[PDB]
Amino acid sequence: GITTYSPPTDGSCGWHVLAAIVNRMINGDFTSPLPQYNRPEDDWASDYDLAQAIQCLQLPATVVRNRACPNAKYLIKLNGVHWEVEVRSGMAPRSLSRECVVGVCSEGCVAPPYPADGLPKRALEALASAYRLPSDCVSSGIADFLADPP
Ligand SMILES: [Zn+2]
């Protein structure tokens, strides 16, 4: 039993995917609350951008390549050239390693339970502030916010 979120194809798809994961974890609402932001193709969030942001936001998510990490609650995929995200609806979230997050973990990787305090205080505000920055700067943006917000 799986639920897949497909964001509006504004070119900020990648950041809408992360927004949705956070929006589901926090509110049960598996959709992006971020305003649409039309982006040239050159500024589409890359696998590397998403992976760095996952770590800033400390999300139990993976970018899948070949095999999907069996420890990942959220699975970021692209069909065609647009990012989407699946949630394993049951499944308790597990804290993932860099290899799991990046989608290169090998057969029978291991992950511990994700803690109740695992998610940053105001993670979604952080993402809101940063997602209109150039895609490769967004993570730094997110990190900036989480170090001191208003
Ligand atoms: Zn893994």
Residue numbers in the entry: 417 to 566
Give excerpts from the publication.
PRRSV replication is accomplished with the help of four virus-encoded proteases–one of which is the papain-like protease 2 (PLP2), located within nsp2, which processes the nsp2|3 cleavage site to release nsp2 from the rest of the viral polyprotein. Subsequent work demonstrated that several arterivirus OTU domain proteases hydrolyze ubiquitin (Ub) thereby downregulating Ub-dependent cellular innate immune signaling pathways as means to evade host antiviral mechanisms. To this end, we determined the crystal structure of the PRRSV PLP2 domain both in the presence and absence of its Ub substrate to a resolution of 2.85Å and 2.3Å, respectively. Overall, PLP2 adopts a similar, compact OTU-like fold similar to that of the previously determined EAV PLP2 domain, comprising of α and β lobes, as well as a structural 4-cysteine zinc finger, and a DALI search indicates the PRRSV PLP2 domain most closely resembles that of EAV PLP2.
To begin characterization of the PRRSV PLP2 domain structure, we determined the crystal structure of the enzyme from PRRSV Type I strain SD01-08. The SD01-08 PLP2 domain crystallized in space group C2221, with 2 copies present in the asymmetric unit. The 2 copies superposed with an RMSD of 0.635 Å over 144 Cα atoms, with unremarkable differences between the structures. Residues 385–415, representing the N-terminus of nsp2 following polyprotein cleavage were not visible in electron density maps. In particular, the α-helical lobe of the PRRSV PLP2 is comprised of a 4-helix bundle as opposed to a 3-helix bundle seen in EAV PLP2. The PRRSV PLP2 active site however is made up of a catalytic dyad formed by C429 and H498 and lacks an obvious third coordinating residue. Additionally, in the apo structure, H498 is positioned away from C429 in a catalytically incompetent conformation. Although unusual, similar active site conformations have been characterized in the OTU DUBs Cezanne, OTULIN, Gumby, OTUB1 and TYMV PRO. Structural regions surrounding the active site of PRRSV PLP2 show a high degree of mobility, as evidenced by higher B-factors in these areas. These regions include the β3-β4 loop (residues 493–499) which contains H498, the 453 loop which extends toward helix α2, an active site loop (residues 422–428) extending towards the catalytic C429, which also forms the oxyanion hole, and the 480 loop situated near the Ub-binding region.
